[PDB]
Design a protein around this ligand. Sequence first.
Ligand code: NA
Length: 129
Amino acid sequence: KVFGRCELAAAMKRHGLDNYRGYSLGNWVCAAKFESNFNTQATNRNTDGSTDYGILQINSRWWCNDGRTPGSRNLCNIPCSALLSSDITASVNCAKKIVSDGNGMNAWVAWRNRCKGTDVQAWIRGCRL
Ligand code: NA
């Protein structure tokens, strides 16, 4: 599924992402914009052979099982495919564990490089939330 901006903002809020670990909804929407362009089916193969899955491009090295990332963990206790669902529940639950890991949203390199320190509230501007 390709979400609308305000549509994704609403889904993330509904699943308690807004101000989760102190990160406003605009941070989450910005990260999703640059990770996936709001496409739940987005995948990206990394050089290390791990893969990134879904609206927030969660990686198989730590967070999900894809059966093809040697020596990897599955800390969200999910098949990586669950992260490609039109239903963002698995992505949001897993993102809550990731953003709790110690480095906050710096875990998403694209959030650090493209969202961090920017006017992120622009990403929920005009949305009925
Ligand atoms: Na894994």
